[PDB]
Amino acid sequence: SVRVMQLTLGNSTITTQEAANSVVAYGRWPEYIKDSEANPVDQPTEPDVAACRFYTLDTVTWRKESRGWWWKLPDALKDMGLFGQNMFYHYLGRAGYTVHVQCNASKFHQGALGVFAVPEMCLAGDSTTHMFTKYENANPGEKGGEFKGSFTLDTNATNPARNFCPVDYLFGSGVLAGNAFVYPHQIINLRTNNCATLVLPYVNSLSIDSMTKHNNWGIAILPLAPLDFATESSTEIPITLTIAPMCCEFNGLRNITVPRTQ
Amino acid sequence: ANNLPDTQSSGPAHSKETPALTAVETGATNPLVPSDTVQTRHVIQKRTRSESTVESFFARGACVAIIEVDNDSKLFSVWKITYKDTVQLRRKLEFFTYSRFDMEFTFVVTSNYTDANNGHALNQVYQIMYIPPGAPIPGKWNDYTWQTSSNPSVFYTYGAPPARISVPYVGIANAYSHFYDGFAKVPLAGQASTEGDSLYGAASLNDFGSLAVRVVNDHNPTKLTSKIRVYMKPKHVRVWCPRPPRAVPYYGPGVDYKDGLAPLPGKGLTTY
Numbered sequence A: 001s002v003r004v005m006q007l008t009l010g011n012s013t014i015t016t017q018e019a020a021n022s023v024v025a026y027g028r029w030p031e032y033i034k035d036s037e038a039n040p041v042d043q044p045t046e047p048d049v050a051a052c053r054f055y056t057l058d059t060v061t062w063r064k065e066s067r068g069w070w071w072k073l074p075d076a077l078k079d080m081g082l083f084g085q086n087m088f089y090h091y092l093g094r095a096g097y098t099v100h101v102q103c104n105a106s107k108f109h110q111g112a113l114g115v116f117a118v119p120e121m122c123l124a125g126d127s128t129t130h131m132f133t134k135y136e137n138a139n140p141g142e143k144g145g146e147f148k149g150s151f152t153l154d155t156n157a158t159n160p161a162r163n164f165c166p167v168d169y170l171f172g173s174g175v176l177a178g179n180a181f182v183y184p185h186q187i188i189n190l191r192t193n194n195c196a197t198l199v200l201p202y203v204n205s206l207s208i209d210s211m212t213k214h215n216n217w218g219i220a221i222l223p224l225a226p227l228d229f230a231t232e233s234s235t236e237i238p239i240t241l242t243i244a245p246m247c248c249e250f251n252g253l254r255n256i257t258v259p260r261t262q
Numbered sequence B: 001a002n003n004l005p006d007t008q009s010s011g012p013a014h015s016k017e018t019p020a021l022t023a024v025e026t027g028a029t030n031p032l033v034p035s036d037t038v039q040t041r042h043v044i045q046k047r048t049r050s051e052s053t054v055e056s057f058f059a060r061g062a063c064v065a066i067i068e069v070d071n072d073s074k075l076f077s078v079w080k081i082t083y084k085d086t087v088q089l090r091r092k093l094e095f096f097t098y099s100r101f102d103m104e105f106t107f108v109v110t111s112n113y114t115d116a117n118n119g120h121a122l123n124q125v126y127q128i129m130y131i132p133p134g135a136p137i138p139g140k141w142n143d144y145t146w147q148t149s150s151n152p153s154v155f156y157t158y159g160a161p162p163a164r165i166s167v168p169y170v171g172i173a174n175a176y177s178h179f180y181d182g183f184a185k186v187p188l189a190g191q192a193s194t195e196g197d198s199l200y201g202a203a204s205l206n207d208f209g210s211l212a213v214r215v216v217n218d219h220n221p222t223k224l225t226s227k228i229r230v231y232m233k234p235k236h237v238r239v240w241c242p243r244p245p246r247a248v249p250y251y252g253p254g255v256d257y258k259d260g261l262a263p264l265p266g267k268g269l270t271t272y
């Protein structure tokens, strides 16, 4: 039925008994580069089962006060097994994804989470200096980031944070959040479903790019209807994020990249 | 101006054929492609060399002269036709030894009052007369030579779109020579040193003649100056014998050099 599914990729399987169908972004399933759209001339590496499998990133907790969370792809998976290895050993890389967000509660809980997949999800910074966010802050990895309820300008001139300041109702980029529904999405309304499943093809203005310099997709999760339970002002339910890269192919092998951190 | 070949997929090798090894002493360049030294994938090539054709490389109007006339002998000026008065077009032409093409000349004319608060003049008309080598050159801005009964003239009204005319291939040889390793005279044994001496690399003393420019209106005591910028574009181009481009500053009409003889910067041998 629309509600029961099983996803198998490599050596990993995911089962769900409360789905609300699955979304295939823009109606496009991920695919490899065709010869007619090929650019780099060298033989690509395609790890296949070693990289195209389900990786579970860290679990976040939803509370009445949560504003939202965000992650960047392939960034969030840079340290994930052999996918991360191939990402850093190659100059160029390409991949699609199957994003599976998990969140179960009970029949006496309420709340709705909007799960959006955004191509080129550029976020707003914290200073008066334009495009000032530094690489280390823009790429948090598997832990991702969070949305805020208001904009707060960083004034420390001696030691600028050079970080993002994504305000939730402004979708972290100066647009109204209610219009974010034009992007592939699903809603995890506690009275209806457990999860949200989105299949994302590779989207870019090029056939292949640098995975370290460029993040193709952004995953934004916003509480559309806040978490509430029985009468417990105190309520916490975890949100686990499991993502699997698809049709990975890398070009331009050399020595490994070791990016600067923190 | 066409397509480039596709990249064919290439796998591993273990053979007695070694395209990587060669011997440049022969004077030939090793025609290798990526698949000769690495494993390649099949790529359908869609890039073309449409913009690097000899025609597209020269298909631009380049400035070759700025003729100036002061409508208060300066009432008229004469410019000896050449492409060596400027450096940009000259350097591009000199990538080749010989050339053959037609020419398109566009004239951009500007004028202004020298005085911010003095004088006035009605709209000016200019006459650009071509004086082929041999024809009488004007001595005054208004002598008989300006009747142009045979010389081609162009009358330009100030403010009108730039004037433009086309000239056929006018060389007396089968192609224009960008380089001429010789003289126009051979000094003979016995003659005075003053005799038989000529410039090295020069052909005719007057190759293509010159342009005589003047303002046709009667000059008013007002101080005015006009400038005619000449733009030339080679069209229907054919070129022969490539040469390395000019690396140091030009020093005259010849290949002479003097000043910027150290064009390259310093860089460590093992510095990326």
Ligand SMILES: COc1ccc(OCc2ccc(COc3c(Cl)cccc3Cl)cc2)c(Cl)c1
Pocket (backbone or CB within 6 Å): B064, B081, B082, B083, B093, B099, B103, B105, B128, B129, B130, B152, B153, B154, B165, B167, B170, B176, B177, B178, B208, B211, B232
């Ligand atoms: C190798 O590169 C070359 C070769 C020959 C060249 O000049 C030959 C040449 C001969 C006659 C005329 C005369 O053209 C004109 C006429 Cl009819 C009427 C009005 C104005 C002009 Cl302008 C103009 C140029 C140049 Cl500029 C570059």
